[PDB]
């Protein structure tokens, strides 16, 4: 209804809920998350075709 | 007798028997006012008491069908216009809201004489051309193929070797062009245009 | 859409008629009337709410009329009253589903939900039959009659068969409803009774008369099964006789007084 | 009225959220681990010239097979190419031109397309007749569609205008779940490899991660000073990069709930239009409104390299699902495969 | 007894006398529910004891025909949609499929008045050109022809010298619109694609 600014309260409620779950969501340490990212990357940086060069007769662009 | 549950009715001298609630379905029909028992509307047969209504029985049928199941169905011989004005007499907005839409559909289809075909320029290799045409999407009609003098691979064996112009029929007159303001859409349109 | 007014104006008399049928008045309303009423009610895409309304109205009718009366008649042919109540519900809900074949036909499949009769029988099984004071009263009295007949009494075999078939048909997913309320208590009481009987007769009588007695008891179990129980119950219970009487007491039968195997 | 209390509540919560991010605000180990040798300089080469297109190419997206890439042009034609042979496996004219998004089904059976028509058409490539026939048209997203992604061969998400990403079960063509978090209209999308949380980027600079199970916005992210152009979820389904009309890309994490790292340079000013990871995600490939795209080192945020090519802006990017190579949908009507 | 071999139905005030077994043909129709004598059925036209139903006798025609002999028949004037909804009312599942199929076929054909056209690209030299053009396969409309500089045998008298695009009109629903892929059909299609 218009008396409640088109009942715009619901938008504020949804925003508040989003922030509530953001608060509830724990914040794993930034350095920790970065370390995890490098862990996965190096676990897969030794097979990335763009990082690890592909044999000239292996990439499906010279065969 | 003492109460009227299934009322017999005269529409242009024809018997129509139906329950009140079918007629009392919406609160706008002239028939709704008829259902209400009051001295003002006292016009019926002296034989069976069927109310005498000087309206068309043939165009009354679709209206009764709508009032029974909220959908107007008109046989493939009765003009939608005639039922339109018959309902206008029976004064049902929402129903009329649909009769006008049906009429507009008919008028647009009849106005499809300058049908708006959507044209596309698919481009294919001579090699891929056979499959492209064979595999050309159903619903689209081939219009023209054109070979061009290519510079790469001489004037043939080229991706731009063949330009297969195709088209598809669109009933845009019933559809209506879908143009509306979307700010980011306009920004994208202008950016791409230049 | 903007159709709530007459939606309620039809719903109220629809539920009045539903109650009248559940109150067993079929002299003031006609089938096709309510049939079309339910149909059109569906046609406004109100199937879900009528599904729910049927659910709760029948729930109310059962709890405030059926369950209460069943609890009132615990000490007077309680099984007969429960069976009659079930039958009246079955009739009533039969013509109710006749009314609303449509949501039964189109809404149920559209929502992939239990059909209308599935709902009726589910609510009857839960709110009256599986209802604690009724479920357990039924189970215990069933075991009472069946044991008394086992003791050598003549009881209402038809009523016991009635109980078995209640549980059967009110079993929606299958025999599980039949299983838990009565079938499992019945098989357990039969197993313990057979255990005690086997021990008593092994101690008392000879091996040959023991075989005769256990065979006659197998026959009497068949008698019980086709006079007061369900056929699918036949195989478990006879197997129980085989185990309690025979399998558990195989070699002890070999030698007994002057009429053991060697004898 | 009570809106004052409501915005005060949102304000105290959000301030505490900032304070929690500050609580998690550590020395980002990534650039702290700058001693780690970077990716060096990658001399990257084009190997295919998918010049079959003639109009501006808006959306290009590899198929799950890493061989069939579907690219839509401005004129309204999808071209599914055999990447390794430069042969148009298909050329689908569109009922409406100005198609912004092309989405390939996980199985390769379906392709989704949408744009200013406001409807996501789904083309069922596999047909007994052999003719690509439209399967379902997803209409209802009043705002123009901007980027679509396939949850399944029956399930899809369509990042459209109208600040919505409503998920569709293709068969019924209904938006079973709706997403309404963004204030600006959504214009980018990216599915988690987990395929349970999808991150949406709108004109309001808000990168809202959504829970596909129920339709709630799992997390909100910010840091880009303008509309978010493209999102590439990290192969772990826990972090995702993001570009914008600014010359800055920012990498965020689900758990950290804040920007992990930034990617910008003074020399670059044109807005980022497409972001993409490598096989391992170490290389952050960013498509620029500038004539050419660049590759960043995700964990070291240095100038990994540039894909010097094209004679128009690159408007869409995508690496092979296996990370073998990468295509660059552009506006000079050429998709160039880089490897 | 009260059971009569013939049962009279007052469909919208119109009497329909039919054998009960004709109406009892299926245990699903609303009419079948009418057939049995139950307390639920109370209202009947006292004039002849005809069960009064406020539904269209015009759309009762095809329904009664199918129920009597298991086959639906809709004239070229009565709306298929109206009989469809009437049958929906009387709750006969089986015939719904037939009506839906007929409606879909007609509506598709009308809306697809441009019906899915198949297109093929034959390739021939100038010499054979007249041979196959003259001997086009009955029902196939020639659509276009293009001259290509032959890469072999000079630029002419070679199969690559000319390309002839032809097509044929299909019938979408009348010939059926169903794709039934199989696993091995899928493998073959994949092999064909690449």
Swiss-Prot record, chain A:
Gene3D superfamilies: Transducin (heterotrimeric G protein), gamma chain. Keywords: Acetylation, Cell membrane, Host-virus interaction, Lipoprotein, Membrane, Methylation, Prenylation, Transducer. It comes from the Eukaryota. It is found in: Cell membrane. InterPro entries: G-protein_gamma-like_dom, GGL_sf, Gprotein-gamma. One of its GO terms (cellular component) is extracellular exosome. Guanine nucleotide-binding proteins (G proteins) are involved as a modulator or transducer in various transmembrane signaling systems. The beta and gamma chains are required for the GTPase activity, for replacement of GDP by GTP, and for G protein-effector interaction. Belongs to the G protein gamma family. This is Guanine nucleotide-binding protein G(I)/G(S)/G(O) subunit gamma-2. It comes from Homo sapiens (Human).
From Swiss-Prot, chains B, E:
GO terms for cellular component: Cul3-RING ubiquitin ligase complex; cytoplasm; cytosol; nucleus. The keyword ATP-binding does not apply. It is found in: Cytoplasm, Cytosol; Cytoplasm; Nucleus. Transmembrane segments: none annotated. Residues 181-194 have a biased composition (Basic and acidic residues). It comes from the Eukaryota. Keywords: Acetylation, Cytoplasm, Host-virus interaction, Nucleus, Phosphoprotein. The keyword tRNA processing does not apply. Residues 5-107 form the BTB domain. Induction: Up-regulated in peripheral blood lymphocytes stimulated through the T-cell receptor. Residues 174-194 are annotated as: Disordered. Homopentamer. Interacts (via C-terminus) with GRASP55/GORASP2. Interacts with CUL3 and with ubiquitinated proteins. Interacts with CRY1. Its interaction with CUL3 suggests that it may act as a substrate adapter in some E3 ligase complex. Does not affect the function of Kv channel Kv2.1/KCNB1, Kv1.2/KCNA2, Kv4.2/KCND2 and Kv3.4/KCNC4. This is BTB/POZ domain-containing protein KCTD5. The gene is KCTD5.
Curated annotation (Swiss-Prot), chain C:
Neddylated. Attachment of NEDD8 is required for the E3 ubiquitin-protein ligase activity of the BCR complex. Deneddylated via its interaction with the COP9 signalosome (CSN) complex. Changing residue 262 to A: In NEDAUS; decreases interaction with KEAP1. Brain, spermatozoa, and testis (at protein level). Widely expressed. It comes from the Eukaryota. Belongs to the cullin family. Forms neddylation-dependent homodimers. Component of multiple BCR (BTB-CUL3-RBX1) E3 ubiquitin-protein ligase complexes formed of CUL3, RBX1 and a variable BTB domain-containing protein acting as both, adapter to cullin and substrate recognition subunit. The BCR complex may be active as a heterodimeric complex, in which NEDD8, covalently attached to one CUL3 molecule, binds to the C-terminus of a second CUL3 molecule. Interacts with RBX1, RNF7, CYCE and TIP120A/CAND1. Part of the BCR(SPOP) containing SPOP, and of BCR containing homodimeric SPOPL or the heterodimer formed by SPOP and SPOPL. It is linked to Pseudohypoaldosteronism 2E: An autosomal dominant disorder characterized by severe hypertension, hyperkalemia, hyperchloremia, hyperchloremic metabolic acidosis, and correction of physiologic abnormalities by thiazide diuretics. This is Cullin-3. The gene is CUL3.
UniProtKB/Swiss-Prot annotation, chain D:
The modification N-acetylserine is found at residue 1. Pfam families: WD40_Gbeta. Guanine nucleotide-binding proteins (G proteins) are involved as a modulator or transducer in various transmembrane signaling systems. The beta and gamma chains are required for the GTPase activity, for replacement of GDP by GTP, and for G protein-effector interaction. WD repeats lie at residues 45-93, 94-139, 140-180, 181-222, 223-266, 267-308, 309-339. It comes from Homo sapiens (Human). Belongs to the WD repeat G protein beta family. Phosphorylation at His-265 by NDKB contributes to G protein activation by increasing the high energetic phosphate transfer onto GDP. This is Guanine nucleotide-binding protein G(I)/G(S)/G(T) subunit beta-1. PROSITE patterns: WD_REPEATS_1, WD_REPEATS_2, WD_REPEATS_REGION. One of its GO terms (cellular component) is extracellular exosome. It is linked to Intellectual developmental disorder, autosomal dominant 42: A disorder characterized by significantly below average general intellectual functioning associated with impairments in adaptive behavior and manifested during the developmental period. MRD42 patients manifest global developmental delay commonly accompanied by hypotonia, seizures of various types, ophthalmological manifestations, and poor growth. The keyword Acetylation applies. The modification Phosphoserine is found at residue 1. It comes from the Eukaryota. One of its GO terms (molecular function) is GTPase binding. The lineage of its organism: Eukaryota, Metazoa, Chordata, Craniata, Vertebrata. The modification Phosphohistidine is found at residue 265.
């Amino acid at each position: 209804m218009a008396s409640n600014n088109t009942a715009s309260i619901a938008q504020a409620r949804k925003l508040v809920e989003q922030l509530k779950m953001e608060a509830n969501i724990d914040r794993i340490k930034v350095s920790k998350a970065a370390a995890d990212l490098m862990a996965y990357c190096e676990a897969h940086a030794k097979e990335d075709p763009l990082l690890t060069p592909v044999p000239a007769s292996e990439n499906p662009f010279r065969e | 007798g003492s109460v009227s549950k299934w009322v017999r009715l005269n529409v242009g001298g024809t018997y129509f028997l139906t329950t009140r609630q079918t007629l009392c379905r919406d609160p706008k029909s002239f028939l709704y006012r008829l259902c209400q028992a009051d001295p003002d509307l006292d016009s019926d047969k002296d034989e069976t008491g069927a109310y005498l209504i000087d309206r068309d029985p043939t165009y009354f049928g679709p209206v009764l069908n709508y009032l029974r199941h909220g959908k107007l169905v008109i046989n493939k011989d009765l003009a939608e216009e005639g039922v339109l004005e018959e309902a206008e007499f029976y004064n049902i907005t929402s129903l009329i809201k649909l009769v006008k839409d049906k009429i507009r559909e008919r008028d647009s289809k009849t106005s499809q004489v300058p049908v708006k075909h959507v044209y596309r320029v698919l481009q294919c290799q001579e090699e891929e051309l056979t499959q492209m045409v064979s595999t050309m999407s159903d619903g689209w009609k081939f219009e023209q193929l054109v070979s061009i003098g290519s510079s790469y691979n001489y004037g043939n064996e080229d991706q731009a070797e063949f330009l297969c112009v195709v088209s598809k029929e669109l009933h845009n007159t019933p559809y209506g062009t879908a143009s509306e303001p979307s700010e980011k859409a306009k920004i994208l349109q202008e950016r791409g245009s230049r | 859409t903007m159709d709530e007014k007459y939606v309620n104006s039809i719903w109220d008399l629809l539920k009045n008629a539903i109650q009248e049928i559940q109150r067993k008045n079929n002299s003031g309303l006609s089938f096709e009337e309510l049939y079309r009423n339910a149909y059109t009610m569906v046609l406004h895409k109100h199937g879900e709410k009528l599904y729910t309304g049927l659910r709760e109205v029948v729930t109310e009718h059962l709890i405030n009329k059926v369950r209460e009366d069943v609890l009132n008649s615990l000490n007077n042919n309680f099984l007969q009253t429960l069976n009659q109540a079930w039958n009246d519900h079955q009739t009533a809900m039969v013509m109710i589903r006749d009314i609303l074949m449509y949501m039964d036909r189109v809404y149920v499949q559209q929502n992939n939900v239990e059909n209308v009769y599935n709902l009726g029988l589910i609510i009857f099984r839960d709110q009256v039959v599986r209802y604690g004071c009724i479920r357990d009263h039924l189970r215990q009295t069933l075991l009472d009659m069946i044991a008394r007949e086992r003791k050598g009494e003549v009881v209402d075999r038809g009523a016991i068969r009635n109980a078995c078939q209640m549980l059967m048909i009110l079993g929606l997913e299958g025999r599980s409803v039949y299983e838990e309320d009565f079938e499992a208590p019945f098989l357990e009481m039969s197993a313990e009774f057979f255990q005690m009987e086997s021990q008593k007769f092994l101690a008392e009588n000879s091996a040959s008369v023991y075989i005769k007695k256990v065979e006659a008891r197998i026959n009497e179990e068949i008698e019980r099964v086709m006079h007061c129980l369900d056929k699918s119950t036949e195989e478990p219970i006879v197997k129980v006789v085989e185990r309690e009487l025979i399998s558990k007491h195989m070699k002890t039968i070999v030698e007994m007084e002057n009429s053991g195997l060697v004898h | 009225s009570e809106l004052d209390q409501l915005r005060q509540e949102a304000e105290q919560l959000k301030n505490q959220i900032r304070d929690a991010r500050k609580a998690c605000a550590d020395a980002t180990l990534s650039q702290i681990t700058n001693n780690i040798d970077p990716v060096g300089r990658i001399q990257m080469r084009t190997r295919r010239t998918l010049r079959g297109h003639l109009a501006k190419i808006y959306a290009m997206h590899w198929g799950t097979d890493s061989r069939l890439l579907v690219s839509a042009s401005q004129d309204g034609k999808l071209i599914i190419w055999d990447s390794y042979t430069t042969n148009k496996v298909h050329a689908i004219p569109l009922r409406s031109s100005w198609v912004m998004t092309c989405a390939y089904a996980p199985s390769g059976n379906y392709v989704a397309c949408g744009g200013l028509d406001n409807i996501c058409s789904i083309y069922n490539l596999k047909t007994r007749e052999g003719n690509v026939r439209v399967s379902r048209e997803l209409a209802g997203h009043t705002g123009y569609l901007s980027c679509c992604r396939f949850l399944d061969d029956n399930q899809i998400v369509t990042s459209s205008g109208d600040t919505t990403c409503a998920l569709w079960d293709i068969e019924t063509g209904q938006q079973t779940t709706t997403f309404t978090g963004h204030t600006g209209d959504v214009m980018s999308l990216s599915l988690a490899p987990d395929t349970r949380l999808f991150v949406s980027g709108a004109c309001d600079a808000s990168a809202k991660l959504w829970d596909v199970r129920e339709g709630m916005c799992r997390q909100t992210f910010t840091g880009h000073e303008s509309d978010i152009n493209a999102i590439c979820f990290f192969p772990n389904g826990n972090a995702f990069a993001t570009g914008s009309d600014d010359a800055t890309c920012r990498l965020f994490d689900l758990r950290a709930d804040q920007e992990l790292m930034t990617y910008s340079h003074d020399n670059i000013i044109c807005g980022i239009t497409s972001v993409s990871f490598s096989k391992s995600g170490r290389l952050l490939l960013a498509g620029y409104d500038d004539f050419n795209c660049n590759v960043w080192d995700a964990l070291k945020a240095d100038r990994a390299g540039v894909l010097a090519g094209h004679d128009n802006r690159v408007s869409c990017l995508g690496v092979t699902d296996d990370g073998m190579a990468v295509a660059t949908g552009s506006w000079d009507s050429f998709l160039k495969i880089w490897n």
